[PDB]
Amino acid sequence: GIREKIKLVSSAGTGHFYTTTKNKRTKPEKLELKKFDPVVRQHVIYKEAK
Amino acid sequence: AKLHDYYKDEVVKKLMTEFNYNSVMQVPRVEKITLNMGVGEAIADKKLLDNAAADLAAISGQKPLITKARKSVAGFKIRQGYPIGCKVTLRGERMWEFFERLITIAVPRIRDFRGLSAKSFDGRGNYSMGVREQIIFPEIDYDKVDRVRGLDITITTTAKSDEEGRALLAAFDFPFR
Amino acid sequence: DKKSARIRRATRARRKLQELGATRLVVHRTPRHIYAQVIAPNGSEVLVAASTVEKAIAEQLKYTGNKDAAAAVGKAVAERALEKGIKDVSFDRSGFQYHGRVQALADAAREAGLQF
Amino acid sequence: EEITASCSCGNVMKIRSTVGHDLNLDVCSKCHPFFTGKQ
Amino acid sequence: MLQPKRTKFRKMHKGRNRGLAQGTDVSFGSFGLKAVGRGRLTARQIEAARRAMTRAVKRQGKIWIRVFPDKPITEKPLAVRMGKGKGNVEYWVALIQPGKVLYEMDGVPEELAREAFKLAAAKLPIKTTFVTKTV
Amino acid sequence: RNGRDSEAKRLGVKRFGGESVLAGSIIVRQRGTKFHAGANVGCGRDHTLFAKADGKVKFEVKGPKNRKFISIEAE
RNA sequence: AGUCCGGAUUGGAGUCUGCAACUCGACUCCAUGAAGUCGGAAUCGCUAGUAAUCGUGGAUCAGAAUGCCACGGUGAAUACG
RNA sequence: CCUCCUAAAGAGUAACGGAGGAGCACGAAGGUUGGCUAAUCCUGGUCGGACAUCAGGAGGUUAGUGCAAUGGCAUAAGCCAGCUUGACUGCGAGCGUGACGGCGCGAGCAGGUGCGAAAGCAGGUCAUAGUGAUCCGGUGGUUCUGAAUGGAAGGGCCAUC
RNA sequence: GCCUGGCGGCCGUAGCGCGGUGGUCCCACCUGACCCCAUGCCGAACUCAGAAGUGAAACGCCGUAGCGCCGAUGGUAGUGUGGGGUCUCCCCAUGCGAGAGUAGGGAACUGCCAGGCA
RNA sequence: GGGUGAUUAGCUCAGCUGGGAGAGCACCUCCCUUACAAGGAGGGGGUCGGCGGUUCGAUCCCGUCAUCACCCACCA
Ligand SMILES: [Mg+2]
Ligand SMILES: [Mg+2]
Ligand SMILES: [Mg+2]
Numbered sequence A: 001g002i003r004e005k006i007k008l009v010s011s012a013g014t015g016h017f018y019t020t021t022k023n024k025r026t027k028p029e030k031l032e033l034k035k036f037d038p039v040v041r042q043h044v045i046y047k048e049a050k
Numbered sequence B: 001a002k003l004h005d006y007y008k009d010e011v012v013k014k015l016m017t018e019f020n021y022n023s024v025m026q027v028p029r030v031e032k033i034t035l036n037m038g039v040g041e042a043i044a045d046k047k048l049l050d051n052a053a054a055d056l057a058a059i060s061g062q063k064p065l066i067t068k069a070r071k072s073v074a075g076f077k078i079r080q081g082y083p084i085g086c087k088v089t090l091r092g093e094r095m096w097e098f099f100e101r102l103i104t105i106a107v108p109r110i111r112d113f114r115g116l117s118a119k120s121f122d123g124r125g126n127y128s129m130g131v132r133e134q135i136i137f138p139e140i141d142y143d144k145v146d147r148v149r150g151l152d153i154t155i156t157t158t159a160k161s162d163e164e165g166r167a168l169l170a171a172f173d174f175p176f177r
Numbered sequence C: 001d002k003k004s005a006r007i008r009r010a011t012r013a014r015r016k017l018q019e020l021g022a023t024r025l026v027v028h029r030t031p032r033h034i035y036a037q038v039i040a041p042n043g044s045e046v047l048v049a050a051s052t053v054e055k056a057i058a059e060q061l062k063y064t065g066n067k068d069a070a071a072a073v074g075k076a077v078a079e080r081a082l083e084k085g086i087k088d089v090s091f092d093r094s095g096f097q098y099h100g101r102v103q104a105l106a107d108a109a110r111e112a113g114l115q116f
Numbered sequence D: 001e002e003i004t005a006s007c008s009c010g011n012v013m014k015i016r017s018t019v020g021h022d023l024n025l026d027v028c029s030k031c032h033p034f035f036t037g038k039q
Numbered sequence E: 001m002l003q004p005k006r007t008k009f010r011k012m013h014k015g016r017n018r019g020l021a022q023g024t025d026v027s028f029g030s031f032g033l034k035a036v037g038r039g040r041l042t043a044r045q046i047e048a049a050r051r052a053m054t055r056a057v058k059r060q061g062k063i064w065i066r067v068f069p070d071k072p073i074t075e076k077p078l079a080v081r082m083g084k085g086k087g088n089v090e091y092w093v094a095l096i097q098p099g100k101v102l103y104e105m106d107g108v109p110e111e112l113a114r115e116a117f118k119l120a121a122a123k124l125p126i127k128t129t130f131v132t133k134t135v
Numbered sequence F: 001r002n003g004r005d006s007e008a009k010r011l012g013v014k015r016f017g018g019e020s021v022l023a024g025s026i027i028v029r030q031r032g033t034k035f036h037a038g039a040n041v042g043c044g045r046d047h048t049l050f051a052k053a054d055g056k057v058k059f060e061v062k063g064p065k066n067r068k069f070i071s072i073e074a075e
Numbered sequence G: 001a002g003u004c005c006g007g008a009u010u011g012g013a014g015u016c017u018g019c020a021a022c023u024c025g026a027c028u029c030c031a032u033g034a035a036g037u038c039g040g041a042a043u044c045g046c047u048a049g050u051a052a053u054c055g056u057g058g059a060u061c062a063g064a065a066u067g068c069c070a071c072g073g074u075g076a077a078u079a080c081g
Numbered sequence H: 001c002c003u004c005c006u007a008a009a010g011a012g013u014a015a016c017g018g019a020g021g022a023g024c025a026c027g028a029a030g031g032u033u034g035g036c037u038a039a040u041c042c043u044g045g046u047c048g049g050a051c052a053u054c055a056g057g058a059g060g061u062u063a064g065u066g067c068a069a070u071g072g073c074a075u076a077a078g079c080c081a082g083c084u085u086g087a088c089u090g091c092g093a094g095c096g097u098g099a100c101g102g103c104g105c106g107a108g109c110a111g112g113u114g115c116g117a118a119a120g121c122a123g124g125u126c127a128u129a130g131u132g133a134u135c136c137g138g139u140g141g142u143u144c145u146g147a148a149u150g151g152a153a154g155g156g157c158c159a160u161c
Numbered sequence I: 001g002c003c004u005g006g007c008g009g010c011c012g013u014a015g016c017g018c019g020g021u022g023g024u025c026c027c028a029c030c031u032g033a034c035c036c037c038a039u040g041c042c043g044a045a046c047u048c049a050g051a052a053g054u055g056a057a058a059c060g061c062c063g064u065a066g067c068g069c070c071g072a073u074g075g076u077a078g079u080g081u082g083g084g085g086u087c088u089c090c091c092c093a094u095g096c097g098a099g100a101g102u103a104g105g106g107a108a109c110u111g112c113c114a115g116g117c118a
Numbered sequence J: 001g002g003g004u005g006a007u008u009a010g011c012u013c014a015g016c017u018g019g020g021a022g023a024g025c026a027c028c029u030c031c032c033u034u035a036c037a038a039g040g041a042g043g044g045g046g047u048c049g050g051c052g053g054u055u056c057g058a059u060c061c062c063g064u065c066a067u068c069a070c071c072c073a074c075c076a
């Protein structure tokens, strides 16, 4: 798998991730993204792919 | 400021009496002066351009600007958008300072000088020239050389003809064979 | 070129607000005589005009073409628009950076009561 | 910064230059062998 | 032998030959050879007629060819089943509508042009006729 | 081996001039902006020109570059 | 250090020889300062005042030597075999 | 699976008809605000050369649009920088296109973000390909169920492999 | 009533080019650049305070047909329906009528507001 | 006809999943030899059959043309 499928786990106390695709040979770093989380229904920073 | 004011009185009245224009804004004035250095052999040595930029920011007063490679060619084995050369644009007070410190103290330290050429104009009134050595500017300590890196100068003016630009620069020294 | 360059900077909003169809507050800047216009949504009919080429703002004032003039320009626009019943508008930056005299003009319009 | 150049022609000339040091010269625009060189 | 040096594509549909011609007025030389029938000409026919004309005036005079093929004819080979793709190209043709001026000549007498064109008219699949310079 | 083609994507004008249409009705499925958005018309992300209000459909020809605009009337 | 080493090549100005210096020379001066930082495989000489190095004289000739003939200054190593 | 022609000017239309591409990519190449306009040729310019980087002129989209083609793009959908996560969730009046499963466009509502002073824009990329039904099982969450009862194993639902 | 500045309707009968004119006012070039702002280097741009010069360039108006542009009438090509022939094509009756080309037209037209002028 | 591989210095082969052309024999100049061959040291030689092209760029990637080698050409 060249471009590989990963997820975006919320840093809150909520068991929710989004899901997207990353590459290996372009990004050695993990992905930080602010995103909505429908438990507290606000926007939380996301990290921890897979 | 000096050769600026020298223009502002003598060259203005001189050219107006020469070409008897309808108005004074129709006279040639120098619009900008650009300076280029093609660093191309720095395809491998990335800091060759960094020290050449320090050299040009010692020649000029102001910090330079790198140039992006426009379109990639295999004739020079370059990639499109490559760190490829460095330029300095000059307008206004620093432009007149650079022209002052050029024509007074740099042209006669050109290696084995004879007067500059005649057909070096564009055809629509601009000028350009290229150097060989680079301690012709005083800001370079002789014990700091690392290549024979030259550079070229472009005086861009509003001369509506190259002969008008010739008569503009004949008010200066501007050696003229 | 300069004039057509500014118009192709402005044509963005000058046809988007057309397609919205709302009342437009249009400006023209020159370091002498800032101009201010309030135009109906179609674009062919103006409503409220105030400019420093008019004597009533020219003679009461320090210098034609500074932000301290433009403040009173938009203030006069706001009074002449409220007396005709126009307060809810939209703004035409006319290809100008919202930084200088247009910023002072619109801010003093908002302090005067023109509320877009 | 403005400095002062001075050549051997007696041409004391103050100029702005980013040398950061006063300057000694020989040839100026005044008294250079350009016309004698062409001759 | 007259052949496009490069073409945009290999092949072309069959197409039709409906209607009349355009290149009708004599516009270069003094005398003209004009198509009356309707059909298509090969490069071999065109070259052979050119050789006949240049034979009759022997070298001297100037001769115009107003036509050029720019249309191939695909030909499936002997003993190939139908289908399996459109055939390969073996000869090029020109589309002929009636009234099309084919050849043109200047620098000779009228009777000589007249007999040279009747020599080359037998080289051609169609009836052709003789025209003069007009307005 | 040469013969091949896609499935045709059923483009074109679905509702012509002079028809009382309803809101959100697709009028034109096109690729570029060969037909241009105008009064009461949104341009889709595939440039599907879609309607915003009830009423008729009028093909205007406006603009300096002689473009083709679609509009919804009321009466 | 291509260095005050090295001297080619070249520009100019000379001198003397000889009918004669372009095909040709010898020398002085001014200026120039290439490669060459110890030499691939191979290869030469030499048992004592020689090996090596530094000068000089002659013969040829009207004019030349880094060549030939001859002389002098200093002056080694190794031989178990 | 996508694009053009064959397609006879609504849609569609076959063949071992003529020609090409896709089984990917991106944390910017996405969103927004502010802003800019390319190819090619000529001239002048040290190494520098038919062609690197500079300046001017003609020209005016021939260039670009992540890629094959077609359509389109100057209000740029091409290019630069700053700020950023709307490549958010729950819904959907209505429409289109397929026999069906499905696929696609979507104004607008509630919550809650980013950009802009504001009017406003943003439910991924200019669009059209970049894909896999069901079953079976994996992982996380759970106002569901729990074979006497309380739990559990399992089953469901939501998310996904 | 004239000119100028802005916003529009229309999108080349409005656009190119060539010659002429305009600066009280309006417009542009311009002066200076510490701070607002800004240059991946530069007050070239963007921005700011101004008004010494100037219509050179640019903009507006006037005149002119070297091109772009519009463009009939008639005829031709094609075509729907019906009939036919020497049916690769074409004709007859009837309805519809191009494109190109020809004589021509032509240096735009109209509205809202403000300022200077009579 | 049709599917598969090859055209490279004078000769024979690896270089084709994209950015510098290598190996061996031969050739040429020296060396020891009375003189060759063998042996030791040192060099250059192609424009990758050809036509077009994609791309910044082709021996390499794509479509034909000339030549070579191989496999098929069955039911009858
Ligand atoms: Mg002995
Ligand atoms: Mg000797
Ligand atoms: Mg039809």
Ligand SMILES: [Mg+2]
Binding pocket: none
């Ligand atoms: Mg269709």
Ligand SMILES: [Mg+2]
Binding pocket: none
């Ligand atoms: Mg923008």
Ligand SMILES: [Mg+2]
Binding pocket: none
């Ligand atoms: Mg469970």
Ligand SMILES: [Mg+2]
Binding pocket: H147
């Ligand atoms: Mg039980």
Ligand SMILES: [Mg+2]
Binding pocket: none
């Ligand atoms: Mg003028």
Ligand SMILES: [Mg+2]
Binding pocket: none
């Ligand atoms: Mg017509």
Ligand SMILES: [Zn+2]
Binding pocket: D007, D008, D009, D010, D011, D025, D026, D027, D028, D029, D030, D031
């Ligand atoms: Zn001096």
